[PDB]
Amino acid sequence: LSDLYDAFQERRQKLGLSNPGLVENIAKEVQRDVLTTNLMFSGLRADLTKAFSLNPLFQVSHQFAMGERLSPYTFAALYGTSKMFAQGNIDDQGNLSTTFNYRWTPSFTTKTRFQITPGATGQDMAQFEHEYSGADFTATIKALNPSFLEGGLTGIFVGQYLQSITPKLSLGLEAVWQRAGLTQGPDTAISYVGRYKTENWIASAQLQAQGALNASYWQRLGEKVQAGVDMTLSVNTKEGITTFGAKYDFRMSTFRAQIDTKGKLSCVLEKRVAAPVMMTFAADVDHFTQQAKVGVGISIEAGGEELQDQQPAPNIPF
Amino acid sequence: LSDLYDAFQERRQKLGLSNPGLVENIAKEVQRDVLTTNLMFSGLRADLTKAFSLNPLFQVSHQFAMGERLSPYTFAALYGTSKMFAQGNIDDQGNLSTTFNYRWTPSFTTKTRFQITPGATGQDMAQFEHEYSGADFTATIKALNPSFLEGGLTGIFVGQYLQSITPKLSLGLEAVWQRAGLTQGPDTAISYVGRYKTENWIASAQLQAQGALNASYWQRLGEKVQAGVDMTLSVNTKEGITTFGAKYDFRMSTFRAQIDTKGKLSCVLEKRVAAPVMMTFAADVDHFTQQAKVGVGISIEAGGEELQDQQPAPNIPF
Amino acid sequence: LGADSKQERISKLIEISRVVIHYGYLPMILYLGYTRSEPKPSIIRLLSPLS
Amino acid sequence: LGADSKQERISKLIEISRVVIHYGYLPMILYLGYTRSEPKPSIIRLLSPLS
Amino acid sequence: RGWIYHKYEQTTSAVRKALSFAGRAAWTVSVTALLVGVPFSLAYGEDQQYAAMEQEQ
Amino acid sequence: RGWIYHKYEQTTSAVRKALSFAGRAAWTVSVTALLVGVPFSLAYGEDQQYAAMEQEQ
Amino acid sequence: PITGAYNALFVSENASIVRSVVAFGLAVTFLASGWAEAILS
Amino acid sequence: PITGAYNALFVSENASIVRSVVAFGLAVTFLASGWAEAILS
Amino acid sequence: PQPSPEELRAAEAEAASTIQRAIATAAVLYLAPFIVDAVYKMF
Amino acid sequence: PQPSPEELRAAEAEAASTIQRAIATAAVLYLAPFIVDAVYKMF
Ligand SMILES: C[C@@H]1CC[C@@]2(OC1)O[C@H]1C[C@H]3[C@@H]4CC=C5C[C@@H](OCCC(CO)CO)CC[C@]5(C)[C@H]4CC[C@]3(C)[C@H]1[C@@H]2C
Ligand SMILES: C[C@@H]1CC[C@@]2(OC1)O[C@H]1C[C@H]3[C@@H]4CC=C5C[C@@H](OCCC(CO)CO)CC[C@]5(C)[C@H]4CC[C@]3(C)[C@H]1[C@@H]2C
Ligand SMILES: C[C@@H]1CC[C@@]2(OC1)O[C@H]1C[C@H]3[C@@H]4CC=C5C[C@@H](OCCC(CO)CO)CC[C@]5(C)[C@H]4CC[C@]3(C)[C@H]1[C@@H]2C
Ligand SMILES: C[C@@H]1CC[C@@]2(OC1)O[C@H]1C[C@H]3[C@@H]4CC=C5C[C@@H](OCCC(CO)CO)CC[C@]5(C)[C@H]4CC[C@]3(C)[C@H]1[C@@H]2C
Ligand SMILES: C[C@@H]1CC[C@@]2(OC1)O[C@H]1C[C@H]3[C@@H]4CC=C5C[C@@H](OCCC(CO)CO)CC[C@]5(C)[C@H]4CC[C@]3(C)[C@H]1[C@@H]2C
Ligand SMILES: C[C@@H]1CC[C@@]2(OC1)O[C@H]1C[C@H]3[C@@H]4CC=C5C[C@@H](OCCC(CO)CO)CC[C@]5(C)[C@H]4CC[C@]3(C)[C@H]1[C@@H]2C
Ligand SMILES: C[C@@H]1CC[C@@]2(OC1)O[C@H]1C[C@H]3[C@@H]4CC=C5C[C@@H](OCCC(CO)CO)CC[C@]5(C)[C@H]4CC[C@]3(C)[C@H]1[C@@H]2C
Ligand SMILES: C[C@@H]1CC[C@@]2(OC1)O[C@H]1C[C@H]3[C@@H]4CC=C5C[C@@H](OCCC(CO)CO)CC[C@]5(C)[C@H]4CC[C@]3(C)[C@H]1[C@@H]2C
């Protein structure tokens, strides 16, 4: 009866909890904000982005690239709204990656992704994601290549849960169920996560039940500097790597540098060389082989000048 | 008798001729000043140069490099004087390249070069060069690995002659004699060169008697811009390539760009990012394969600030 | 367990949907943008990179 | 034509000269510089890269 | 009937070839303009700022 | 006699190993200081020029 | 007529020589005519 | 004593794990102790 | 080799049990803040 | 195969003749400006 639900929720709200965010973001500050891993590239790269409006967000992008595992050309377009976000990008070889996110409810959103490769049968993947963001938790279920055609379920199904335990501590869970086909038995994995977040530092751990462990620590070293440490241990042979890095935010540039136990040094400099133009320098150095990989990239955004008067749409479900 | 020599030279001087320079410099303005060929590199490179004096010139250099066919480290030192120039550089693998140039006379100079590779027997080369610069000509003879040990001459002997015909036209010759050993007969090649040089444009041709032809044209496109075209034809299969390029001299940077008939685009930007520090960006693009080679380099010169009062030594025979 | 004809036809629908997605997804986004952006750009300018 | 002993000894001189050049050439330049440059640097500063 | 289907295939080969050339030609023109025009515009633009700072003296 | 020659070889192996480590360690320290210190000093130095232009207002 | 311009310029053993000689002639005439300075300077 | 520090840290199957755990502990204590800010900020 | 008909049962059951205890764990976490708070109140 | 004793003579002579005409060409070039000037004077 509602008599319990009303009293139960009132006690729940008195605990001062907040939404802990996604399980995949539990270590975002180290692995994405401080570390270079997601910004590293080699060769030449150029992105030309034209923004046609901010509400609804609509922009078109052309990427030219010549480098390791970089497709020569990629056309992209995105359309955003407070309730929806559609994105598509296609390679010169016809590989199409699509995104369609829709807010059915302010708390419930469905994310649909397709990957279509024409030249190679490869993986033509369909991923159906359902996220619920509660007052103090978030729950997600992903279905990747779901099928019932063989008379039984097939594909990869991932459940995720993250719960705020205290205003600082969140604990969570991820569970996977897999079956390549009815010829084989289903495979299941469980991962445990947790995070302690304060204003100046954040600690996170990801524990795969099969033996892998990822621990990360982030700390703000003043207004312009932040640093973080990322340790990955695999004991499934035994392998361990620790990456330490720092990020500096200047008025017109951001500098990142990191070193890791495998002797790899890498740095990324992003520099606002002009009002619409941002240059990127990325360098990777392996001290064991004395080999370096250098990436120079440019980004230009024509659209914004005319549209600055108009305002970006709130809560686009990217 | 001197009666003829005095009258002969007086008529010679009345012709308004001047020293035409070296045969190897007959196309310098295109191939070295405008084109990118000698500045292109890939990967990371850093040169640290300390100058200890300008008269006598003495400086020490450390090069760090990580790239295609770039040795990880190279120590170098040079000592210069109006009468002599000694230079040595050695790799991390012990490859020593040496130079010793001496002005026996203001018109006559001997250049001695050694290459010593410890790890691989390879080529341990000794090159003995003798240059004479006359009032209107220059003559050179090079002996590379000369030997009389087998009871007969062996090695590569190159004679060069360049003659000013008019204040603008110089014509020249290069002749080679080769013998790998007394087991085989001597091989001889002749190359013809010429150049027409004016204030705004320079035309050069190099004609190998065996069939290769190199034509180049340089033109100054105003105070800050110069351009040049380089054609190489080989008819020994038949192969031809034409490279067109331009160089821009700005206050704090020099930009070079070139394209050639083989579809290769390359550019080099040299930028004075600081008083002692010069950055270099080099990019090579092959339009047939859509592959790019990127080189980022830095050069720093600590020494000059204290020594600016002192003046560089005149006529160092580099 | 299953049905042979039902599986054959269902798979055929997926390859129809896959082809429609492959060809129609980006033109769809461009249509949503072109007709709802403020202001509305030109048809040629809609795909111009920086003009 | 030639002489066996003369060729053996001459070649030996070249490998002596080659070893002296390989080891002594750069120290020689550094000595010429250090003793004749104006002003004269320090022995440690002589090989310092940028200090 | 089949005469139309052969023509359809004949068109596809030529048209697909035409689009591949046009797309490949457009790529090289774009990449050339970027690799030359970007460093030049930054170098030329900085040179003009120094020229302004001299004129303002 | 031979006892000295063996010691000479024993020294050469250890000393050549020592120089290779010292040279290799010096290279990585230099390359690390360059690749991190050069972009940082240019970025940090430019930031200070903007800070000066604000203070001078 | 036009076929004789294609074969010797793109599908013959000496076509590479012809292409470079034409590219050299065009580049020099571009520079020497003053059009390059009027555009590049 | 010292030999037991070398073998488990550089020449054992689990030595890679030990090295990364030590590098993680040192980096976190460097940051958390305030020495990093006093040097890097 | 391919699994026999009851070896699939073992795999299908073992997979089901892991997912049943995963959802059981998420239920404990959801109720956990009421428990953690009480211990702080006791302190 | 290796060259016979008179085939080396042919190679040694042919190489000598090319170098003799190279030095002969350089002598003509050295004297050439007196010739080129005279034609201009005639004009
Ligand atoms: C599933 C796995 C379980 C472990 C884990 O998730 C993964 O779960 C979290 C538990 C966290 C700790 C809990 C509490 C504190 C007290 C705090 O004290 C600050 C001052 C305070 C007085 O103590 C104010 O009064 C310091 C930090 C510490 C020890 C946390 C560190 C990070 C930890 C280890 C997190 C870790 C990532
Ligand atoms: C199981 C996995 C192994 C790795 C790991 O868990 C997961 O192990 C945990 C240990 C944690 C540290 C413990 C205590 C402190 C002291 C605190 O300082 C505030 C002062 C305060 C008490 O000292 C009184 O003022 C700052 C944070 C810090 C350093 C924690 C950081 C995160 C760490 C490294 C966690 C890390 C992610
Ligand atoms: C061994 C090979 C023989 C060819 C060559 O070396 C190699 O030797 C040179 C001969 C040169 C030409 C001689 C004279 C002129 C007249 C001048 O006229 C300007 C105005 C003038 C009136 O004519 C003033 O009054 C234009 C240029 C031209 C044709 C030269 C071009 C470059 C040439 C072809 C050079 C070429 C590189
Ligand atoms: C055998 C090899 C084949 C390639 C080559 O020789 C070597 O062939 C030559 C032809 C030469 C051009 C001929 C004439 C002119 C006209 C002049 O313009 C001044 C105006 C003036 C006469 O027009 C009256 O004012 C500028 C120079 C230019 C373009 C020469 C440039 C160099 C060229 C390309 C030479 C090139 C190196
Ligand atoms: C058509 C294809 C795509 C676009 C393109 O051709 C090919 O068109 C060219 C025009 C170039 C820009 C011209 C002028 C400048 C100003 C300079 O300085 C501004 C300083 C800032 C300080 O805030 C304002 O003062 C910065 C660079 C920029 C924007 C050029 C960038 C590259 C561009 C986009 C080139 C690019 C290659
Ligand atoms: C010991 C080893 C070699 C040297 C080294 O450590 C390792 O030592 C570091 C010191 C750095 C310099 C510090 C400050 C600046 C000023 C900045 O701005 C000036 C602007 C200009 C305008 O004319 C004057 O105002 C330009 C860069 C520069 C010179 C740094 C360059 C890199 C250097 C040399 C670093 C290098 C990695
Ligand atoms: C044998 C090979 C075939 C290709 C080629 O040699 C090699 O054949 C040559 C013919 C030359 C042109 C002849 C005459 C002139 C007039 C001159 O003067 C005009 C005045 C000017 C203002 O200055 C414009 O009004 C300008 C130059 C030009 C066009 C020559 C350009 C180079 C060319 C194309 C040379 C080219 C490289
Ligand atoms: C299990 C694994 C072994 C390694 C490790 O976990 C993983 O073991 C943990 C022990 C931690 C330290 C314990 C206590 C403190 C005091 C705290 O407060 C002081 C006040 C400060 C001012 O703020 C200085 O006075 C500062 C931090 C520090 C040193 C911890 C640092 C991180 C450490 C090294 C953790 C490390 C990552």
Q: List the single residue in A with minimal CA-CA distance to H12.
A: A238
Cis? peptide before I33, omega within 30° of 0:
no
* 3-state secondary structure (DSSP) of residue D45: helix
For chain H, helix (H) and strand (E) counts, in that order, are: 3, 0
Q: How far apart are CA B123 and CA A1, in angstroms?
A: 94
Partners of residue A269 in chain F, C-beta under 8 Å: 39, 43
Structure tokens at G2: 């036009």
Cis? peptide before C39, omega within 30° of 0:
yes
CA distances (Å), origin I24, targets A173, G2, I21, I29: 11, 80, 5, 9
Q: How far apart are CA A248 and CA A244, in angstroms?
A: 14
- Which residues, including other chains, have CB under 8 Å from residue D1's CB and lie 6 or more apart? B151, B152
Q: How far apart are CA J23 and CA J29, in angstroms?
A: 10
| Beta carbons within 10 angstroms of residue G1's beta carbon | 4
Helices (H), chain D: 4-36
CA geometry: angle at B63 spanning B61 and B66, to 5°? 180
For residue A196, the CA-to-ligand 1 centroid distance in Å is 5
Instruction: Tell me which DSSP letter residue B205 carries.
Output: E
Straight-line distance from the first to the last Cα atom of chain F, in angstroms, rounded to the nearest whole number: 82
Q: How far apart are CA B59 and CA B303, in angstroms?
A: 8
CA distances (Å), origin F40, targets A256, A257, B180: 9, 9, 54
* 3-state secondary structure (DSSP) of residue B245: strand
- Answer whether E34 contacts ligand 5 (Cβ < 6 A): yes
Does any domain span residue B2? no
Q: How far apart are CA F19 and CA E2, in angstroms?
A: 80
CA distances (Å), origin C39, targets A86, A313, A316, C26, D33: 19, 15, 19, 20, 71
Helices (H), C1-51: 4-36
- Which residues, including other chains, have CB under 8 Å from residue G3's CB and lie 6 or more apart? none
For residue A257, the CA-to-ligand 6 centroid distance in Å is 17
Q: How far apart are CA A215 and CA A234, in angstroms?
A: 12
| Beta carbons within 10 angstroms of residue B246's beta carbon | 23
CA distances (Å), origin D42, targets B275, D28, F30, F51: 25, 16, 21, 38
Q: How far apart are CA A194 and CA A169, in angstroms?
A: 7
Q: Which residue type is seen at B9?
A: Q
Query: Could you tell me which of A274, A296, E48, F41 has the C-alpha nearest to residue B273?
Result: F41
Q: How far apart are CA B298 and CA E28, in angstroms?
A: 29
Contact criterion met (CB below 8 Å) for H18 and H9: yes
Put simply, the answer to whether H17 touches A261 (Cβ < 8 Å) is no
* 3-state secondary structure (DSSP) of residue H34: coil
CA distances (Å), origin B41, targets A267, B95, B171, B265: 20, 20, 34, 14
Q: How far apart are CA A91 and CA E27, in angstroms?
A: 13
Does any domain span residue C25? yes
CA distances (Å), origin A158, targets A164, A175, A176, B222: 20, 6, 4, 67
Q: How far apart are CA I1 and CA I14, in angstroms?
A: 20
Do B and D make contact, counting contact as 3+ CB pairs within 8 angstroms? yes
Contact criterion met (CB below 8 Å) for B260 and B40: no
Does any domain span residue B168? yes
What size, in residues, is chain G? Answer: 41
Contact criterion met (CB below 8 Å) for B228 and B27: no
- Answer whether B203 contacts ligand 3 (Cβ < 6 A): yes
H or E stretch covering A172: strand A169-179
Q: How far apart are CA A203 and CA B25, in angstroms?
A: 65
Alpha carbons within 13 angstroms on the beta-carbon side of residue A55 total 9
Does any domain span residue C16? yes
| Phi (first) and psi of residue B302, to 5 degrees | -65, -40
Contact criterion met (CB below 8 Å) for B83 and B97: no
CA distances (Å), origin A7, targets A136, A300, I27: 17, 55, 19
Q: How far apart are CA A288 and CA A271, in angstroms?
A: 30
Q: Which residue type is seen at A268?
A: V
Q: List the single residue in A with minimal CA-CA distance to I9.
A: A185
* 3-state secondary structure (DSSP) of residue F27: helix
Q: Could you say which of J2, J7, J33 has the minimum Cβ distance to residue B166?
A: J33
Q: Which residue has the tokens 């204590």?
A: H29
Does any domain span residue A6? no
Structure tokens at B218: 């340089």
| Phi (first) and psi of residue D37, to 5 degrees | -65, 150
Mutate to test the pocket of ligand 1, among A191, A196, A204 (most ligand atoms within 8 A of CB): A196
For residue A187, the CA-to-ligand 6 centroid distance in Å is 56
Q: Could you say which of B139, B172, B187 has the minimum Cβ distance to residue J15?
A: B187
Diameter of chain E by CA atoms?
Answer: 82
How was this structure determined? It was done by cryo-EM
Put simply, the answer to whether B173 touches J22 (Cβ < 8 Å) is yes
Q: How far apart are CA I15 and CA I4, in angstroms?
A: 17
Q: How far apart are CA A240 and CA A234, in angstroms?
A: 6
A294 at the F interface (CB within 8 A)?
no
Centroid of chain to Cα G4: 16
| Beta carbons within 10 angstroms of residue B245's beta carbon | 25
What size, in residues, is chain E? Answer: 57
Give B173's strand partners. B161, B192
Q: How far apart are CA B80 and CA B87, in angstroms?
A: 8
Does any domain span residue A313? no
H or E stretch covering A13: helix A2-13
Query: Could you tell me which of F49, J27, J38, D39 has the C-alpha nearest to residue B274?
Result: F49
Contact criterion met (CB below 8 Å) for B154 and B180: yes
> What is the extent of the structural domain holding C15?
1-32
Q: Which residue has the tokens 């060169």?
A: B193
CA geometry: angle at A30 spanning A25 and A31, to 5°? 70
Structure tokens at A138: 């978030």
Task: Report the neighbours of H using a cutoff of 3 or more CB pairs below 8 angstroms.
Answer: A
* Ligand 6: residue whose CA is nearest its atom 15: F41
- Which residues, including other chains, have CB under 8 Å from residue B265's CB and lie 6 or more apart? B257, B258, B259, B284, B285, B287, E31, E32, E35, E36
Query: Could you tell me which of B63, B71, B77, B51 has the C-alpha nearest to residue B298?
Result: B63
Q: Work out how many domains chain B is built from and give that number.
A: 1
Q: How far apart are CA A241 and CA B118, in angstroms?
A: 38
Q: Which long-range contacts (CB under 8 A, 24 or more apart) does B80-86 make?
A: B80/B56, B80/B313, B80/B316, B80/B318, B81/B56, B81/B57, B81/B313, B81/B316, B82/B313, B82/B314, B82/B315, B82/B316, B83/B317, B84/B317, B85/B316, B85/B317, B85/B318, B86/D28, B86/D29, B86/D32
B149 at the D interface (CB within 8 A)?
yes
Structure tokens at E12: 């596809």
Q: Work out how many domains chain D is built from and give that number.
A: 1
Based on its alpha-carbon atoms, the radius of gyration of chain I, rounded to whole angstroms, reads 19
Q: Which of A266, A294, A296, A298 to mutate to test the interface with B (most CBs of B within 10 A)?
A: A294
Helices (H), A204-314: 304-307
Contact criterion met (CB below 8 Å) for A67 and A297: no
| Beta carbons within 10 angstroms of residue F22's beta carbon | 10
Q: How far apart are CA A267 and CA B143, in angstroms?
A: 49
Contact criterion met (CB below 8 Å) for J8 and B185: yes
| Beta carbons within 10 angstroms of residue G23's beta carbon | 20
Put simply, the answer to whether B255 touches E51 (Cβ < 8 Å) is no
Does any domain span residue B312? no
Contact criterion met (CB below 8 Å) for B313 and B56: yes
| Beta carbons within 10 angstroms of residue B5's beta carbon | 9
Query: Could you tell me which of A301, A291, A290, A266 has the C-alpha nearest to residue A41?
Result: A266
* 3-state secondary structure (DSSP) of residue A253: strand
Contact criterion met (CB below 8 Å) for B188 and B173: no
* 3-state secondary structure (DSSP) of residue E37: helix
> What is the extent of the structural domain holding B107?
18-306
Put simply, the answer to whether D25 touches B98 (Cβ < 8 Å) is yes
Does any domain span residue C15? yes
Instruction: Tell me which DSSP letter residue B309 carries.
Output: S
Cis? peptide before B56, omega within 30° of 0:
yes
Contact criterion met (CB below 8 Å) for A90 and C21: no
Give A44's strand partners. A66, A296
Where residue B274 sits, what CATH number does that domain have? Answer: 2.40.160.10
- Which residues, including other chains, have CB under 8 Å from residue A41's CB and lie 6 or more apart? A67, A68, A70, A282, A295, A297
Q: Which residues of A38-52 are buried (b: 16+ CB within 10 A; e: fewer)?
A: ebbbbbbbbbbbbbb
Contact criterion met (CB below 8 Å) for B172 and B159: no
Q: Which residue has the tokens 């250090």?
A: D34
Structure tokens at B67: 């790239």
- Which residues, including other chains, have CB under 8 Å from residue A36's CB and lie 6 or more apart? A245, A256, A257, A258, A266, A267, A268, A282
Q: Are strands A291-301 and A43-54 parallel, antiparallel or unpaired?
A: parallel
* Ligand 4: residue whose CA is nearest its atom 26: G32
